[PDB]
Design a protein around this ligand. Structure first.
Ligand SMILES: [Mg+2]
Lengths: 468, 225, 136, 104
RNA sequence: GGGCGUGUGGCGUAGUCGAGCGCGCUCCCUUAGCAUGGGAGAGGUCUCCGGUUCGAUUCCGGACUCGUCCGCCA
RNA sequence: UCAUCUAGACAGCCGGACGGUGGCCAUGGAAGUCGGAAUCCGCUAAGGAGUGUGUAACAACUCACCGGCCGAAUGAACUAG
């Protein structure tokens, strides 16, 4: 029924992900189940399910998966069917199944593995080392729809104990690291997706998604284990060294900025750990890419990139804080990039953008990275002009205007100049006279509690009555 | 997911199915794979009704649907209307429309908030749409295509429009609908995108010949991730 | 019909023999279609191959745009004007013979259909039902 | 001896019925991995004609690629090369007789 | 339908098994006109495919193409 | 018309089917089996300087020959009713 030998694999002598003596790899060309092992399978029905899984067509793959699930559901009848041999074969195919583009295939595969673990509890211990990292990768996924059922099922498998879940991270941290390393470095878009059946695009898109999930898993690993960084520093270094994580930070292209955001979270984690400070080259490379990302941000795609911008600013403030803005020193044109970014960012209003700008301004002012009068004051004023034009056409605007004012007032406080104060008063007056639904809206009025003295407000009210 | 499905070989799923947030409608003469796609992806939370509209297997082009209401043509029989009333939840309202154009899926492109209609519909039908669906209505054509339901796919998150559409028409329709719109193709280049696929907040179902860049455009514009 | 049929069709009374000229309902720039053949028709001595509603025919554009004239192309009959019976027993008919242009797989050359189409044609061809305004 | 090993490895993959393009991708991956057998094989493979070309070092540095038929034994493949040499020698002899008369 | 013969450079045309000339125009020189001549140029899968030979334009077999000749009824 | 035959024939099973010798030329090799010639002895009950499969060449297997069981006719080529 099954013929041939994986002679090349025997020469290779690499078990890859698998620690059970069976090579497990994400790539299509290798890691396919060995023919002899498939022959060793307990039943003809099992052999057929495996052949269908091997076949490329999704509809056929799904039908086979459904059949496999049915066998698992009737565990008492099929306990004999399930065997260590089946488990070894399943592990090798499972890795390919998780990488599969189709959502249902992934969801079913995770469900199948969890069901198997519950039924075979205490008998899958040998295979747990192979299974758990893959299961965890599914649980932490960029896509919420696949991840949530998987996470709930995992908790149910472990009898709803959070501590057990945390323990799993600690027990498999080395294994998780190997998996993350393999995805980040060993895997390539070409390995993940066949060149003939897939375009240059999509293959790249797929690779980015897979690595992003691994990065998310990595962030989780750091959070779960404080000591993980120290024990596996060499592995962590290589993963960080690889440009692929950095390649993820591209804002020029890609459907979502979520992947870019995930990397930003990792960078903040590196800063909190001090791992990036400990290894200088990685930190420098990350900073350079972040500066490049600022260039990538453009007016044409600003609407898409606007939610992500406040997050970038907060990260910049932290990196900027480090070492008195050595981050700026790394790039000669970094200041120019920031100024260009500022103009692009201001044109599209975003929630939290002003707060980030003020925080960045505070970080810059210690080293005078941005001149208050030359660049920041005009920029803040331009932001007010933009806000006044958008009065409150897409409210939200009301909170944004208040957010700007609070930050602008603090920015104004650090001027000690009459002209700056006069400009602030004039801008406030211009916004107030033009008005909008702000008098009607309690929230807008309450949020901007004061931009002028109470007596001045009374004087303005008196002036309005006095005015013709 | 944009789920690859065929209706017995047909790569046009919007013709034979109508998908909203609250319910789904499928034709009675359907294959096991075609039913299994909606049963697996939708789950048990959302009812799937096997229905016939006016004696026809085509139901997506005959009916226009919303989470608040469903519109059916005059030719729909009392048995089909009673079966839809029993199978559907109590929240949705089903009302017959007495209007000459009579193919409501072709005539009306609608979502939860805002709707695009054929320009030449009757005023009583426009008020009936605004009453039953609770949806504000605009009479507009997509670059001269009067069949806005066939030539647009619309959801709450975003919209896919006809590929040969003027850019000025794209920002005009985008500002009018308050959602981002992308010109694109479905089912290996077929122009009829609304007939090509169905979409809601978390699911899109398309034909098997829909290629990978087209599917990527679908999931990008409808934010299904 | 033949290849691109989505299901089967009950027998409709044949109303369009070979040589019939019908209106061209779509917006492809052709004015009339001249029927030269019916797909799936049988063989009998002296009997003309006739078409009904929902049938796919071979047709030439006798009047219209010069890049559509002087060549044969497939067409789909959408309006019949000869009265036929349904299984609910209503006898119905349009007031003109009308068809649209298609490829051998059945997708329309044009983009919109003016006037009504029959449900026996709209059920059998989904692209016609997609571009159709009103289905009766 | 090495040639026989190479053939067995390639044959095993073919016996599996794996896609020929897929087999080639694997060979490339093994070369990156540093597998010795993988290194020997030239990357383009005439699987259609069932011939694999493997580089053989001239001196036990320069390597001469030699096409090997998968079906034939390594020694059999060698005999065929010898046979081509033999035929060429026969042709040369005929040419030598021909030249004097032809020149006249 | 059948028979017989035919196929060379952009054009015409010479070929005994060991592709030349002329015409078109590439360049240069040359012109009191009623615009020539001269000198070096480019230009072929010898209709195509197989075998023989040592090598076929050359011999042979097949196919394509063209041109001739003869052919249904009362 | 040739042959074999109760001193054991032809089918069917079972056993041996060997040395000189890897005979002489020729080949990168060819040892019975790519070919060219010769084609002889020993031991024999019997075994070809080989009938095929067979390997790079080997090795290996089988033959046509001899033997136990069987006990009596049989094999090849050709002719014409
Ligand atoms: Mg007749």
């Amino acid at each position: 029924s099954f013929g041939g030998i994986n002679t090349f694999q025997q020469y290779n002598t690499d078990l890859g992900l698998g620690h059970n003596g069976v090579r497990i790899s994400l790539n299509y060309f290798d890691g396919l189940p060995d023919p002899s092992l498939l022959n060793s399978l307990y039943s003809n029905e099992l052999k057929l399910i495996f052949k269908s899984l091997l076949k490329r067509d999704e509809t056929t793959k799904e039908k086979a998966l459904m059949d496999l699930s049915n066998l698992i559901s009737d565990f008492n009848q099929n306990e004999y069917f399930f065997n260590d041999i089946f488990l070894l074969c399943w592990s090798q195919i499972y890795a390919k199944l998780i990488i599969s583009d189709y959502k249902v295939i992934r969801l079913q595969s995770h469900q199948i593995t969890i069901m198997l673990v519950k039924s075979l509890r205490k008998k899958i211990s040998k295979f747990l080392k192979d299974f758990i990292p893959l299961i965890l990768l599914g649980t932490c996924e960029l896509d919420y729809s696949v991840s949530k059922p998987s996470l709930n099922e995992l908790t149910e498998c472990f009898n709803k104990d959070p501590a057990k879940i945390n323990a799993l991270w600690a027990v498999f941290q080395e294994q998780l690291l190997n998996l993350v390393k393999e995805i980040v470095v060993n895997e390539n878009e070409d390995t993940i997706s066949d060149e003939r059946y897939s375009s240059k695009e999509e293959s790249e898109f797929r690779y980015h998604r897979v690595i992003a999930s691994a990065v998310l898993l990595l962030i989780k690993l750091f959070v779960h284990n404080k000591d993980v960084s120290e024990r596996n520093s060499s592995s962590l270094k290589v993963i960080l060294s690889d440009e692929s994580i950095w390649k993820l930070l591209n804002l020029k292209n890609g459907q979502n900025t979520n992947a870019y955001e995930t990397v930003l979270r990792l960078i903040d984690v590196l800063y909190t750990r001090g791992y990036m400070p400990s290894h200088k080259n990685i930190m420098k490379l990350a900073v350079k890419k972040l500066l490049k990302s600022l260039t990538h941000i453009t007016s044409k795609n600003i609407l898409k990139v606007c939610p992500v911008l406040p997050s970038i600013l907060n990260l910049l403030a932290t990196l900027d804080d480090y070492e008195d803005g050595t981050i700026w020193s790394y790039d000669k044109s970094s200041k120019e990039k920031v100024l260009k970014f500022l103009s692009v960012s201001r044109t599209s209003p975003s929630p939290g953008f002003f707060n980030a700008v003020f925080a960045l301004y505070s970080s810059t002012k210690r080293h005078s990275f941005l001149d208050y009068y030359l660049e920041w004051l005009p920029f803040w004023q331009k932001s007010v002009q933009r806000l006044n034009e958008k009065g409150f056409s897409a409210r939200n605007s009301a909170e944004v205007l208040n957010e700007f004012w609070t930050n602008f007032l603090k920015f104004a406080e650090d001027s000690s100049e009459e002209r700056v104060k006069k400009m602030v008063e004039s801008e406030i007056f211009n916004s107030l006279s033009c008005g909008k639904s702000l008098s009607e809206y309690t929230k807008l009025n309450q949020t901007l509690s004061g931009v002028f003295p109470p007596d001045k407000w009374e004087r303005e009210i008196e002036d309005y009555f006095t005015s013709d | 997911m944009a789920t690859r499905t065929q209706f017995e070989n047909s790569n046009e799923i919007g013709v034979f199915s109508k998908l909203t947030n609250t319910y789904c409608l499928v034709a009675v003469g359907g294959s096991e794979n075609f039913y299994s796609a909606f049963e697996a992806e939708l789950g048990d939370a959302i009812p799937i009704v096997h229905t016939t509209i006016a004696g026809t297997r085509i139901i997506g082009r005959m009916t226009a649907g919303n989470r608040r209401g469903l519109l059916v043509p005059t030719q729909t029989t009392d048995q089909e209307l009673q079966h839809l009333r029993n199978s559907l939840p109590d929240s949705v309202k089903i009302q017959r429309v007495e209007e000459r154009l009579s193919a409501l899926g072709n005539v009306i492109c609608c979502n939860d908030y805002v709707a695009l209609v054929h320009p030449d519909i009757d005023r009583e039908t426009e008020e009936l749409i605004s009453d039953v669906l609770g949806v504000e209505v605009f009479r507009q054509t997509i670059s001269g295509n009067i069949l806005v339901g066939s030539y647009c796919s619309l959801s709450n998150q975003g919209g896919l429009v006809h590929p040969q559409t003027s850019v000025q028409d794209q920002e005009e329709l985008s500002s009018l609908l308050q959602v981002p719109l992308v010109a694109g193709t479905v089912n290996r280049g077929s122009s009829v995108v609304g007939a090509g696929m169905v979409v809601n907040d978390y699911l899109a179902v398309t034909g098997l010949d829909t290629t990978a860049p087209e599917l990527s455009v679908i999931e990008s514009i409808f934010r299904l991730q | 019909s033949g290849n691109g049929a989505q299901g089967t069709k009950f027998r409709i009374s044949l109303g369009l023999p070979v040589g019939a000229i019908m209106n061209c309902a779509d917006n492809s720039g052709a004015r009339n279609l001249y029927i030269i053949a019916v797909k799936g028709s049988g063989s009998r001595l002296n009997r003309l191959p006739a078409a009904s509603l929902g049938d796919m025919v071979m047709a030439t554009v006798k009047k219209g745009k010069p890049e559509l004239r002087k060549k044969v192309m497939p067409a789909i009959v959408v309006r019949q004007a000869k009265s036929w019976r349904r299984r609910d027993g209503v006898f119905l008919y349009f007031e003109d013979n009308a068809g649209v242009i298609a490829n051998p797989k059945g997708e329309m050359k044009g983009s919109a259909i003016t006037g009504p189409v029959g449900k026996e044609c709209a059920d059998l061809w989904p692209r016609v039902a997609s571009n159709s305004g009103v289905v009766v | 001896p090495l040639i026989e090993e190479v053939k067995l490895a390639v044959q095993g993959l073919i016996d599996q019925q794996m896609d020929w393009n897929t087999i080639e991708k694997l060979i490339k991956s093994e070369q990156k991995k540093g597998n010795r057998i993988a290194q020997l094989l030239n990357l383009p493979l005439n699987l259609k004609q069932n011939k694999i070309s493997v580089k053989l070092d001239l001196s036990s540095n320069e390597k001469i690629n030699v096409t090997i038929d998968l079906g034939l034994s390594a020694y059999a493949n060698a005999t065929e090369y010898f046979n081509i040499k033999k035929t060429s020698a026969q042709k040369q002899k005929k040419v030598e007789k021909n030249v004097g008369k032809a020149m006249k």
